[PDB]
């Protein structure tokens, strides 16, 4: 996917200040409480019973650590996501077979995360830049089904 | 459907947007404009730069059929006919587009009422828009 | 919505289904496995193969309940309210994996039902069986 | 996308028995009737305003003949979609702004035309191996989107 210079800066000086140890569970337990049928990839993190309970699942936020960095790793090589995430690709899609619309999903939840964490900062044309850069993660996280 | 708790929450957030209400509409579709290109083809006769006025009328427009919406959230096919009947049939809007302005205001909401937006809100406003846009597309003919 | 046209086209269309009603539901169950393989996760009891009789009395339970859609066409939310519990809560069905349902039994009635499947009744069975999804995903919880 | 050599013949065998001057006009034909927001694109077709109207409007039966001409030049070249799409990538997504969604729901309306037309004989495996192929379409006309 190709973000302009002033996409890529204001892209990458917001990514500085996110919380790297949080805002990866906050997106995964509020995909878990959103979409709850998301639930059903996720029964060996045990209490998903409510709101509470899925935000302070230490699985939760120990699991959403690891997705963050993998959006991180996508942010280092935008001109090359297919090859980021071919070994994720087969994960989701061919050992998981999770629906690619929920890729999007999550995509778009991390996206209310950084507009929850960063407020008048996540301007309209910095969401727009990350509106590319959660589908060209999405697309890529696909491509084993396409 | 909309559970009770659904109800109280989306009418505590909603609440609190207040005097801000259109100024969150214009921000939500300026952020859908932007952010999802294709819906630019909608508004030919709207300047979509920032600081429009017409996005900022047709924003306060949204937001009084939302407020409309959550006035009447158990009323709400029967509240918003007349606008379902106009996306639909006159305008034809692709029912794509309403998640893609769902979404964009959830994150005008989500960037304003940082207090607000809980994960058990966020799934309360949620449901509340995939509700109002289920309705607006209800009338494809 | 679905205009009385429509109710007629889809009651008309499904009468012409009679005795291979189990059958053509079986048929649009492996269609899905075949066409769109996620969806064969939900069914790990099952042996999905060619002939299994695991999925023609599946079938015939799928419709069984389209059949009791079209004949409480204007009462759905509640002909069908425990199924929407049953696939939202207890099996947490994705919402997508409806429209690939639906479209395997479009398929399915287009094979079978030639004179019947004009481009009118295609479009009421189309509306038919998204509001038959919209019912079974109303109860995400 | 990859299909198996008995998918190739299957797909290979039932598209030699397409009639190509009606096939895609009933595709597009139906799309305008049962997606009826797709009409907003052609509105210099004239009469849309039945069913009837809409599938024998003669401009709907020429214009769908041309997209049938794209699928079977699709079939011809299915590990390169990409390039083969690119021009029509450029008019659907730059030029025309058509939300992808609608590239995907016309390569459903397309089998289940090809389904109407050759019954018992459009099997579930037949089916499937024409699913990768519309699903492949639809993502390389898309791909000036991502
Ligand atoms: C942009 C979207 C996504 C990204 C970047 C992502 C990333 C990841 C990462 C980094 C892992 C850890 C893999 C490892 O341990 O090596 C993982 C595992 C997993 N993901 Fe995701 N994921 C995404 C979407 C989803 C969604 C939507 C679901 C389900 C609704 C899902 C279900 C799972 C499951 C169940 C595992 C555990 C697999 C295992 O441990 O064997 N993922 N994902
Ligand atoms: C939450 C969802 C939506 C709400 C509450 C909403 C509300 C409204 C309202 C109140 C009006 C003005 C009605 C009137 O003046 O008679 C309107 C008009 C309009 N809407 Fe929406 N709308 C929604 C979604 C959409 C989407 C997704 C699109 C397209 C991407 C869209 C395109 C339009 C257009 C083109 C007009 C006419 C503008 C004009 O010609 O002046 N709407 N909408
Ligand atoms: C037109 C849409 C659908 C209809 C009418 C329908 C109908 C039914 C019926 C009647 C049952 C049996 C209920 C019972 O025995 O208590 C059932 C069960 C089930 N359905 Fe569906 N269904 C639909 C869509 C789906 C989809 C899209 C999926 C997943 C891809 C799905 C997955 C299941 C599963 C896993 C079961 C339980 C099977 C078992 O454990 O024995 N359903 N459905
Ligand atoms: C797999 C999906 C599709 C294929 C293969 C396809 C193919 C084509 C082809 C071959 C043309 C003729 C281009 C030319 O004259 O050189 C065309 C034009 C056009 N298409 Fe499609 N199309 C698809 C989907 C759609 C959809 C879903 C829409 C709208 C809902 C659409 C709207 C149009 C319009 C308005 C034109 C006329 C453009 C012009 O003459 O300037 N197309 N398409």
């Not at chain 1, 302009?4 to 409480?33: I, M, Q």
């Not at chain 2, 919406?69 to 709400?76: E, L, R």
């Not at chain 2, 966020?122 to 003919?141: E, G």
Request: glycine share 6%; proline share 5%.
């Amino acid at each position: 996917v190709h973000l302009t210079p002033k996409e890529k800066s204001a892209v990458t000086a917001l990514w500085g200040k996110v919380n790297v140890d949080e805002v990866g569970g906050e997106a995964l337990g509020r995909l878990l409480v959103v979409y709850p049928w998301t639930q059903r990839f996720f029964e060996s993190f045990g209490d998903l019973s409510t709101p509470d309970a899925v935000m302070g699942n230490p699985k939760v936020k120990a699991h959403g650590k690891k997705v963050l960095g993998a959006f991180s790793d996508g942010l280092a090589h935008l001109d090359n996501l297919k090859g980021t995430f071919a070994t994720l690709s087969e994960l989701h899609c061919d050992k998981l077979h999770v629906d690619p619309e929920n890729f999007r999903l999550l995509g778009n939840v991390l996206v209310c995360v950084l507009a929850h964490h960063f407020g008048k900062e996540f301007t309209p044309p910095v969401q727009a830049a990350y509106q590319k850069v959660v589908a060209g993660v999405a697309n890529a996280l696909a491509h084993k089904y396409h | 459907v909309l559970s009770p708790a659904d109800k109280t929450n989306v009418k505590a957030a909603w609440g609190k947007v207040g005097a801000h209400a259109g100024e969150y509409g214009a921000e939500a579709l300026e952020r859908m404009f932007l952010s999802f290109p294709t819906t630019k083809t909608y508004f030919p006769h709207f300047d979509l730069s920032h600081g429009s006025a017409q996005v900022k009328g047709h924003g306060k427009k949204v937001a009084d059929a939302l407020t409309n919406a959550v006035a009447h959230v158990d009323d709400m096919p029967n509240a918003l006919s007349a606008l379902s009947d106009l996306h639909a049939h006159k305008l034809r809007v692709d029912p794509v587009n309403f998640k893609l302005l769902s979404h964009c205001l959830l994150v005008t909401l989500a960037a304003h009422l940082p207090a607000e937006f809980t994960p058990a809100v966020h799934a309360s406003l949620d449901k509340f828009l995939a509700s109002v846009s289920t309705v607006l597309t209800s009338k494809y003919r």
